[PDB]
Amino acid sequence: GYEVHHQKLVFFAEDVGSNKGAIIGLMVGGVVIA
Amino acid sequence: GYEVHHQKLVFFAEDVGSNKGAIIGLMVGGVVIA
Amino acid sequence: GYEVHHQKLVFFAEDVGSNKGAIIGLMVGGVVIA
Amino acid sequence: GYEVHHQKLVFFAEDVGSNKGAIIGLMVGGVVIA
Amino acid sequence: GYEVHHQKLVFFAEDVGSNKGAIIGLMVGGVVIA
Amino acid sequence: GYEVHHQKLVFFAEDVGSNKGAIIGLMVGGVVIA
Amino acid sequence: GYEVHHQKLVFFAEDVGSNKGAIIGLMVGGVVIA
Amino acid sequence: GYEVHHQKLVFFAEDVGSNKGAIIGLMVGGVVIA
Amino acid sequence: GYEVHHQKLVFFAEDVGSNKGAIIGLMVGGVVIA
Amino acid sequence: GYEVHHQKLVFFAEDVGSNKGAIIGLMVGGVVIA
């Protein structure tokens, strides 16, 4: 008997205000110039 | 017996206000200039 | 017996107000200039 | 009997305000110039 | 009988304000110039 | 002066022959029964 | 002067033959039963 | 003067043959039953 | 003068044959039952 | 003058054959039942 439930993953749990650069949750490869 | 339920994934859980750059949840490859 | 139910994925769970740049949930490849 | 529940992973638990560089949760490969 | 629950992992538990360099939670490979 | 060029991302670089299950490059959400 | 070039990311560099289960490059969220 | 080039990331560099379970490169969140 | 080049990261450098459980390169969060 | 080159990181340098449990390179958080 296996029961897997209620796992929770959050990248940004609160406000992201007045951003002027780069906000990225998950980046695979890719280039960011900020 | 297997029961997998109620997994939750959130990238941005709260407000994203007055953004002037780049807000990206999941970026695979790609180039961001901010 | 397998039962997989009620998985939930959310990119932007709250308000996205007065955006002036680029808001992207999932970007594969692609170029963003902001 | 196995029950795995309520694991929680958070990258940014609080506000990310007035960002001018690069904020990244999980980066695999990739180049960041900030 | 096994019950594994309520493990919690946090990268940034508090505010990340006025960032001008590079803030990264988990970086695998990759190059950061700050 | 910024020049970003010739980034390359490949999911399956070689042959995928006689598949009988599920081959997926990038899966976001979703359920796979194989 | 910044020049970022020729980064290479590969998930499966060689043959994937006679698969009967689940082969996934990048999985975000999601449930796999194999 | 900065030049960042020829970084290489490989998940599976060789053959993945006769798979009957689950082969995953990068898994974020998610549940695997194998 | 900075030159950063030819970094190499490999998860599985050789064959992964006749797998019947779970083979995962990088797992963040998530539950594996094997 | 700085030159950083040819760093090499390998998780599994040789064959991973007839696996029946869980083989994981890098696990952050997460629960493994094997």
CATH, residue E13: 4.10.230.10
- Identify the residue whose tokens are 């194998």: H34
Count of domains observed in chain A: 1
F2 neighbourhood in chain B, CB within 8 Å: 33
E17 burial type by CB count under 10 A (0-12 exposed, 13-18 middle, 19+ buried) = exposed
Question: Resolution to 1 decimal, in Å?
Answer: 2.5
Cβ atoms of B22 and C34 closer than 8 Å:
yes
CB contact under 8 A, G29 and H28: yes
| H5 annotated as belonging to a binding site for a ligand | yes
Q: How far is G22 from chain A (nearest CA, A)?
A: 20
Cβ atoms of I10 and G12 closer than 8 Å:
no
Nearest CA in chain F to C10: F29
Q: How many Å apart are CA B31 and CA B23, to the nearest integer?
A: 13
Residue count of chain F: 34
Give the closest residue to G24 by CA, choosing from C27, J12, I24, I20. Answer: I24
Pick from H14, H26, H33: CB nearest I25: H26
Give the closest residue to G32 by CA, choosing from J34, I34, F33, F19. Answer: F33
| G6 annotated as belonging to a binding site for a ligand | yes
CB contact under 8 A, E1 and D4: no
I to J CB pairs, distance under 8 Å:
121
Burial track B1-31 (b if 16+ CB lie within 10 A, e otherwise) = ebbbbbbbbbbbbbbbbebbbbbbbbbbbbb
Q: How many Å apart are CA H26 and CA G28, to the nearest integer?
A: 8
Burial track C1-34 (b if 16+ CB lie within 10 A, e otherwise) = eeebeebebbbbeeeeeeeebbbbebbeeeebeb
Cβ atoms of J19 and I19 closer than 8 Å:
yes
A18 burial type by CB count under 10 A (0-12 exposed, 13-18 middle, 19+ buried) = middle
B33 neighbourhood in chain F, CB within 8 Å: 2
Cβ atoms of H25 and H13 closer than 8 Å:
no
CA torsion A9-A13-A18-A20 (nearest 10°) is -30
- Check residue G28 and report its DSSP letter: E
Q: Which two tokens stand for residue C33?
A: 């200039």
State the residue range of the domain holding C34: 1-34
Q: How many Å apart are CA I16 and CA G21, to the nearest integer?
A: 13
Q: How many Å apart are CA F19 and CA E20, to the nearest integer?
A: 48
B5 neighbourhood in chain C, CB within 8 Å: 3-7
Q: How far is B29 from chain F (nearest CA, A)?
A: 6
Beta strands in chain E (DSSP E): 2-5, 8-12, 22-28, 31-33
Cβ neighbours of residue A15 closer than 8 Å, sequence gap 6 or more: B14, B15, B16, B17, D15, D16, D17
A1 neighbourhood in chain I, CB within 8 Å: none
List the Cα angle C19/C20/C26 in 5-degree steps: 65
User: Side-chain half-sphere of B26: how many Cα atoms within 13 Å?
Assistant: 19
Cβ atoms of I30 and H30 closer than 8 Å:
yes
Cβ atoms of D12 and E10 closer than 8 Å:
no
Give, in order, the Cα–Cα distances in Å from A34 to each of B4, B34, C23, E20, E26. 40, 5, 16, 9, 18
Cβ atoms of H15 and G15 closer than 8 Å:
yes
PDB experimental method:
cryo-EM
Nearest CA in chain B to A23: B23
- Report F:2-31 residues touching G (Cβ under 8 A): 2-31
Cβ atoms of I8 and J7 closer than 8 Å:
yes
E14 burial type by CB count under 10 A (0-12 exposed, 13-18 middle, 19+ buried) = exposed
